[PDB]
Symmetry: D2
Subunit: 116 residues, 4 copies
């Protein structure tokens, strides 16, 4: 599992459950090609987006639909979504853990990249 | 000043100086039209992006070239850039301050929306 | 102004106004002696804490009463307070800006150290 | 495992390994009593600080020795340490995950509190 995403709610102190996200990969012609998508589980995690074979070198974008999440909780947040854009696997294969911590007017995102 | 951006450097405890960014507005065909751009000053701020007449409701994206900034300092960054995408003015003009705090493998962005 | 504190509210996208804090300095018997205190203004800043003569090298703690702030807004917070503990002036006076960003179950604090 | 701490380095994009921390509990007489201590593992985690029996209701403080960590990496950081002070178990037993994300001049800390 070379790409995993973990989302936390900073207002309730819990995993952010059922957060949708779409992953794109930049194609040869400079457009974003749809790569994978899913929702966070009850542990605030999304596993199985991809595999070591399919997760080739390139520039990827993960767009976390944070606004629907806040909206379903009765909150109007600032952001339309949270986006993480990064070059992956450029020095060979890595495992990427992307973590997003959400507040209605703020978010942060961090990557842990481990050599496996 | 209806839209201000402030960037900070969590590795050095300083403003992030000379950081380039573009601002786009969502156009009705759903693409991103360039709107305003600049570099951060020595206080890590970028002002004068727009005015209140021109800054109408809509979806705006600020794309901060964080990767060039880490490269000039000689430190491998993770992100290509930091994006902030938001709906402005939901019901009327407020002032927006967007602050980004940068680390090579992490960033946070916050909005302060005042009256 | 050698030491300034700024607090922000990530739930509401505003300054955190009226937030109380005390500043302590580490005394040679290793206890924490009160040094300065205040509340944030309407811009979420607290200035005038000390002056450059009085603000000598040493270990300082800023203890931000974040729990009272969340209680007045009616939202259960996790932390008792936020603490920022740092060695000042390692080699000479610099200006310090300590910014705290508050959420009920999270906070971040950053220092901007300038010349 | 009612209390777990996870520390990440935001400069290298990795777990923060071998970070020491001490946990105190506030005693009846308003002093901090030593409660537990340990170091983060290779996954940046510290498990086994306590047990459900010993982890009674009270105000706890976790002091993460972030400065030694930065120092061992050749960096002079701002903070002496990162401290998390909180009331635990006041509405009955909970599981607390405390996460700290470290940069030399900044850190954040978040708690996830789950009912078990
Ligand atoms: C990241 O920590 C900081 C920080 O170190 C400095 C900051 O400075 C600010 C100045 C500011 C405003 C700000 O929001 C900030 C900050 O956000 C700020 C922050 C917090 C920014 C982040 C945690 C990404 C609003 C009020 C106004 C008077 C318009 O000017
Ligand atoms: C800071 O960014 C991260 C991060 O990169 C990894 C994180 O890992 C976590 C794992 C975790 C839990 C977590 O809260 C985290 C993280 O917080 C985490 C974070 C966010 C940490 C901060 C923004 C300080 C909760 C549930 C449980 C199932 C026990 O496992």
């Amino acid at each position: 599992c070379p790409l995993m995403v973990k989302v936390l709610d900073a207002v309730r102190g819990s995993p952010a459950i059922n957060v949708a996200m779409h992953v794109f990969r930049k194609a040869a012609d400079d457009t974003w090609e749809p790569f994978a998508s899913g929702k966070t589980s009850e542990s605030g995690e999304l596993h199985g987006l991809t595999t070591e074979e399919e997760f080739v070198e390139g520039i990827y974008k993960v767009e976390i639909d944070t606004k629907s999440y806040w909206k379903a909780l009765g909150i109007s947040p600032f952001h339309e979504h949270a986006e993480v854009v990064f070059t992956a696997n450029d020095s060979g294969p890595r495992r990427y853990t992307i973590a997003a911590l959400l507040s209605p007017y703020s978010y942060s995102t961090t990557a842990v990249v481990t050599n496996p």
